[PDB]
Amino acid sequence: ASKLELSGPAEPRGSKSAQITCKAKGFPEARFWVFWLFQRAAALDWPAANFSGGPVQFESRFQGNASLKGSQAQANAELNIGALGSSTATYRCGWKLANGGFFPSWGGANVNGAAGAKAPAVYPVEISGAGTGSVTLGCLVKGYNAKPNLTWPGASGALTFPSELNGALWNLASAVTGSGFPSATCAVGFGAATDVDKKVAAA
């Protein structure tokens, strides 16, 4: 079957250049227009398209910001992104049916144009001296530059909010609605070491 394998996530720094590969298989790459997209948090855009045996057609917004290339000796399409800062998005690599104009087969690769790499800080936010039946405990993870995996010791009542940008670092919160409170601890992920688990005390 026709498939398109894209590169992994990348972390350009402000004004670098990021090159994304789109190694295709299952079809002649020189016969079809290989496209590129641009997905933000929730918006689908269109940088450009490239015919592997000829021309490249861009959007007027991405002219000079994106540069497309194609290697027919390896059937690989490359997208080169110039100056960044608001280009932290997800880039897809659809191909266009040679008759219609729609995209049957797609890829997907993340680009995160930020700077810095720090260790997360864990704060056990707790109740403020009140209780009625079920009580809400919390765990605040502040100041990191990756994707962590917050967990709890065998309790499934947790809600882990999506992380947000605060300056140049990321912030995340987790909430647990627990009935009884003998002992509860917050254990975080953050695969780049810095493993820290902190108990949640009263007051």
């Binding site: 918006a43 104009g101 729609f102 995209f103 049957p104 797609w106 403020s128 605040l140 947000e164």
Partner: protein, 201 residues
């Protein structure tokens, strides 16, 4: 470039039928592609030329002549509650609109305020966290340090698989020097005909 769009960015449907509408800024001549995208996955082609499926379950149909198009899912299951896009292949510059389906749940919000911990207070900071774990609809959060504030960062998850309810976390970051304004209150306004206030001193 055309200005195709999907008006409802959110829709409520449980098991009966959904009719996602797309509107085109130009007469596209029945050239509309419909994509389905699940989170963490690329957009999958459902419909092309505004009525023709591509290896998709028979519940996904689509209608529309010009500048008014619809995709009907009359059998909406758990996989069908995803994000649906409409493309157009009439003009050179291709355009999308964005939409999403959601299940229908009751109502009833809940709020809880949490003061900064001693560890954060030691390291030159104070983040007050307001949690809104279970509610349905759209909610608004206001911070009162005896006055309204506009320095808070807010985050929302999606819809829970079991409870079918949304959540919201509001973080108010205040330094130790600015940490004497009195009492801190979190106010939530929902479809409940009254705000919920949680305060600490």
């Amino acid at each position: 470039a055309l200005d195709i769009n999907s008006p409802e960015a959110e829709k409520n449907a449980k098991g009966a039928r959904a009719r996602i509408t797309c509107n085109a800024g130009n007469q596209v001549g029945s050239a509309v592609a419909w994509f389905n995208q699940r989170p963490g996955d690329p957009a999958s082609l459902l419909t092309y030329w505004a009525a023709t499926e591509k290896g998709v379950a028979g519940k996904q149909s689509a209608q529309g002549a010009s500048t008014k198009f619809s995709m009907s899912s009359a059998g909406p299951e758990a996989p069908s509650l995803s994000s649906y896009w409409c493309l157009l292949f009439e003009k050179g510059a291709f355009s999308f609109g964005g939409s999403k389906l959601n299940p229908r749940e009751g109502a009833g919000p809940q709020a809880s305020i949490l003061p900064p911990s001693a560890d954060l207070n030691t390291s030159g900071g104070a983040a007050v966290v307001c949690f809104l774990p279970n509610w349905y609809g759209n909610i608004t959060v206001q911070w009162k340090t005896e006055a309204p504030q506009s320095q808070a960062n807010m985050s929302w998850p999606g819809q829970a698989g079991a409870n079918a309810a949304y959540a919201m976390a509001a973080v108010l970051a205040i330094t130790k020097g600015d940490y004497g304004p009195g009492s801190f209150t979190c106010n939530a306004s929902n479809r409940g005909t009254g705000p919920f206030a949680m305060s600490l001193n």
